Point group: D2
Chain length 391, copies 4
């Protein structure tokens, strides 16, 4: 058996929509986190065989931004690079695909994760035919290609309404979970628990460079009362609000992967061994249930029981879906998203899966957790999961 380790890992801070990284291309965020994982493992950019980056919204950024991030990071031209899209699942899925490159003896050293600038996503129109007369639409690729179900034509937040109703999750319960996520994240932030995983990013300016190293979407002093004033965002008699869904965000996150024996030759003390992974499909109307079969198949492939897990990162696309997954799987909620989740931290789609992986790993190192699981729901009706054991 192969045995592949996460040697090192790093993420930018998650930026607020049209905020800190409002004008920063995904691959620039990418390059920073690629350099990061190299430096942190003590491996030279010249040793990297291939870079694999999940990205959902790459229109107008030019040819293969995975290669632009690779090349900017100083990964030599001789290496290879590609992007991929399994939507919200992409940044964790890229990690599993890198693992496979090594397992099959096609690569020795892989940098894998994801990057997203939802800010820099353009508006678009098909205009070759040419428009003889009449208005036409300029389509927001963020919304069209990121947030709109292709089969049912509505937003992801409507899929969360479907799950809410399915599981009979109240507005109060979904708000209670949001305020708890914000509080957990504000606590971890203040306590320095995100410092290890975050690599600062320098936004180059005209009248000044600006170093970003703090998650800017977390709201300080989140109360239940403010949560409860909000209006439903997708259904007028609905439960889901801007306050209990994640936001629109920018960021990047990566992991350096190699064989267990290679990390040992190099004196590297890996963050984890990738024990299993699994991806599964579900009905798109209730895509927020994805993590349930994916996490169960992952655990099955680890040969692990749910109760064996010491720490979980289960992405918070919406408080409605997150509460459902927790309810179903039954794992102790106190070991879930201990430093808060995507409602607080944000949801830079193609990067999210590597973002939460980062957060799991560094917290597993911090508390001395042995066994961890990362899981995400996926628009169009999928889920992805990964099991990690500490060395």
């Amino acid at each position: 058996t192969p045995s592949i380790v996460i040697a090192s890992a790093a993420r930018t801070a998650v930026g607020s929509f049209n905020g800190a990284f409002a004008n920063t291309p995904a691959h620039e965020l990418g390059a920073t986190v690629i350099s990061a994982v190299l430096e942190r493992a003590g491996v030279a950019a010249g040793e990297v065989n291939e870079v694999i980056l999940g990205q959902v919204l790459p229109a107008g950024e030019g040819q293969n931004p995975a290669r632009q991030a690779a090349m900017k990071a100083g990964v030599p031209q001789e290496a290879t690079a590609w992007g991929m899209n399994q939507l919200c699942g992409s940044g964790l899925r890229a990690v599993a695909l890198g693992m496979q490159q090594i397992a099959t003896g096609d690569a020795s050293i892989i940098v894998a994760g994801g990057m997203e600038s939802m800010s820099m996503a353009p508006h678009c129109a098909h205009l070759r035919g040419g428009v003889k007369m009449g208005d036409f639409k300029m389509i927001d690729t963020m919304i069209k290609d990121g947030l709109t179900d292709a089969f049912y034509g509505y937003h992801m937040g409507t899929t969360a309404e479907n799950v809410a109703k399915q599981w009979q999750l109240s507005r109060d319960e979904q708000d209670a979970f949001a305020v708890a996520s914000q509080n957990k994240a504000e606590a971890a932030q203040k306590d320095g628990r995100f410092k290890d995983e975050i690599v600062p990013f320098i936004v180059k300016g005209r009248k000044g460079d600006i170093t970003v190293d703090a998650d800017e979407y977390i709201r300080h002093g989140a109360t239940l009362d403010s949560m409860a004033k909000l209006r439903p965002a997708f259904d007028k008699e609905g439960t889901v609000t801007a306050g209990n869904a994640s936001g629109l965000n920018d960021g990047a996150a990566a992991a350096l992967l190699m064989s267990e024996a290679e990390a040992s030759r190099r004196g590297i003390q890996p963050l984890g061994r990738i024990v299993s992974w699994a991806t599964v499909g579900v009905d798109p109307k209730v895509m927020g249930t994805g993590p349930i079969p994916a996490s169960r198949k992952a655990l099955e492939r680890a040969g692990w029981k749910i109760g064996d897990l010491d720490l979980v990162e289960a992405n918070e696309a919406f408080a409605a879906q997150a509460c459902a997954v927790n309810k179903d799987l039954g794992w102790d909620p106190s070991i879930v998203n201990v430093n808060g989740g995507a409602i607080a931290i944000g949801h830079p789609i193609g990067a999210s899966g590597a973002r939460i992986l980062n957060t799991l790993l560094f917290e597993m190192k911090r508390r001395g957790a042995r066994k961890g699981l990362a899981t995400l729901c996926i628009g169009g009706g999928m889920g992805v999961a990964m099991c990690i054991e500490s060395l």
Copy 2:
């Protein structure tokens, strides 16, 4: 682990703004997915995952690979995703599918590529807002598909770079394009694309139209018409519209499973995937990609170049193709025997799966044992895959 291609299908390749001018990529993908199932005799319910290369998905909606999958009747339980190694994507996707199976994560994979260059939109980033002055609406087909991100120029400039390096004449590159057209017109007329093509039905308001012929192939291609063309990228250049491939639409896929599985199902596979490899090269000379990628593929298969019976080497430009032939030194008679991308067209994310199909089906026809498929990639890469027949 021994992973075979059970079956393969591709759409005909359309001309830019032509047969598929208003057909979303994923509808071309779905036809190709259903065709691989049907040809193998495998139920859609049995597919674990669909992996589709695609370079130009803007505005087509969430995860068009999943859209293709669902429209093809693959149940909601399966998974799907897209990937982009530019022109390698459609072949790389097949290596990626093979890997899912070789690591025991999946049993049956459909893999390939899909591209509508015609449906690629224009775009601009407009959230900041344009306070004053003119701005550009960007052709994502050009920006995201054909322009080098490091040097800022069109792929055809990289093909010029290779032409100067390998001292390839305008006559030589024209000779290669006329030769590719003649081969592809002969093949077409001879019925040699029939097997590999699945017809696609363009749904219309005043009539459905069935597309089952590659419409970019030009009939009666003469050196004269080639020799009159003006260079397309350098005013003192050698690259033209006629000795470069085109902008095109299409899909192409393969059904992958283990060799033991194929035999349990009584399926006579198109080939066993013996190796593959991808390597990087200077972006400036990206057309050279197939050189290191086919040597590494050949070294991983444990084959010599002389062992190959048939080769598909994608013709992005006459100059890069001639260059790769010259260095690898394989018999040009066994290379793109039914023509190439110059004649056939070059639907970016689909090309690698396109040339795979041609190779597989021609191998079966003429009874070749060992084949190789390879492509150059924008940004400076190569991908290659070694196939042996059962």
Copy 3:
């Protein structure tokens, strides 16, 4: 009492939408008509004091296309020029306004009319504030700024339906009117009656200049059957169709104005004397009724009865409204649009008023008619009318 004459007049052929003049800016057409009126009067460009050109759709054409047209035509930089917009009324209203320049002693020689390139009208969006997220429309300025009612939000065609209903005008009556417009226009064209009024226009090419001197929108051999098969274009239970409405078209048309005393000094035999004009408002919902009060008011001011008129040009925006106007005024339809109207000839919005003035003046001359009237309905609920007498 000041007396102003129309010394000379000319118009381009009226181009089909995206047809002969598809890529010709409105001011190039205008310049040709300016040159033509000068040459027909025996007046030099040096002598013009001001150019006044109606134009509804100048977006993207640059600073003040009226000045562009004047300068191209050799009118000296010491002259002045300006555009105006009273929608369909514009090309006729420009004439009245140029008569007023002379009447108040501010100018001696005016060129006035209108020009329009519906073909070259752009699509637009307000983008300065930025579009933070979600789709936006690229608006067709031709439809938005030319053809849509600003108050009720519907197309001019809907105002036509409102008039069809009010006056109980059958589909059969409108279609017959439309077929009669085509057939009269075709006859006039074939017999050479548009030759005098038309100045040929040279579309400069690349692989060859093309001279345009024939109205291209006129359908030859128009049948009642073909009119009858068309579907209503604005209201699914409607009566107004593409066939019994005017079209989208390009063209220019002008008049050279001076005092009666000045024409006499120059030895010019003028096309006519401007005896009166008028403009009046009506309800936007039935804008097609504008010509009713405008004509009555114009006639009152001239001291004429409806029965005094020898020829009439009443613009055919739509068969419904044309029929309503004829019914209410009660003038002999055999003297109205004797050479066809806009259903056949086309409707280059800002040019149309001076286009039907041209047609009226050259027909008055041909047939020896002493008294004429030109009138148009106007988007937003107005009418304009002018009374002309022969010298």
Copy 4:
């Protein structure tokens, strides 16, 4: 011997580019000024015969914004309305065109002036032919149709440079003039001298209506040093800067006109009698010189010497051109733009001619000036001037 008076007048505050009126359609600003002139004169909306509004940048605003403005202000559907465009000349030219409707007996009561939203001007492109392949430009219509010379291809600011070189006007002279304009405007705003002319405009807001009644573009405490450090904006070795040019601005301004005998019957004390007006062309290259022949011609027509004038408003498109006009005319600079000019106040193009008329009229009344003149330069090479005497 017709004598037309200005019965009442009003303007909005002039907003900054994308400032107070950033999302306010021009006709909304026009409607408030229409209402204000009516209330100020004691004339009812029912009595208005026509509304005439200069406007250069109406693209995307829909059919005939002048009619939109009128209708909004409650001017009856039976009145008429139209827009016109002689660039910077427009708002003043409309007042002359308004005068002429009364003089020729075609109307009794006119509201005339101008309105402009430079902020709301869209970007556009001609897309009907259709873009086969490649990038294309979205054109800024405010720059294209408002600010760029159609003959020479360069900005109005280059024409200012040409005037600077011809009249040898230093950077120090232009900057001193600019600072003076700011400091005069600031003192006037502070002392309340814009109150009488300004009608407050209510900007309707989701989370609050905002009343705008102060000119927001005037810089308070403007320093010479601030002006001196700017880089030339149009030529690298040039002299014209963003500081000694006018701005991009939004606003509206109008005058209610009637015969002198009519104002007498109603007991209205008019703001002034329109004694004369003129418009003349110059070389487009030196368009800022337009006020010179236009003001001389206007004075000739009034039978006045330059020395008879008690107050002048000479629009400050650029310091360079304002200086050249003042030098050539030789009028006492202490009677010119007494309360500041467009450098400070701003330049909402189609409204500007009416804006400066408002300032002249209310300052004439305040100080008891008997004889006044308003003039502006005009893109494409023209000037317009009007003479006003007090009753």
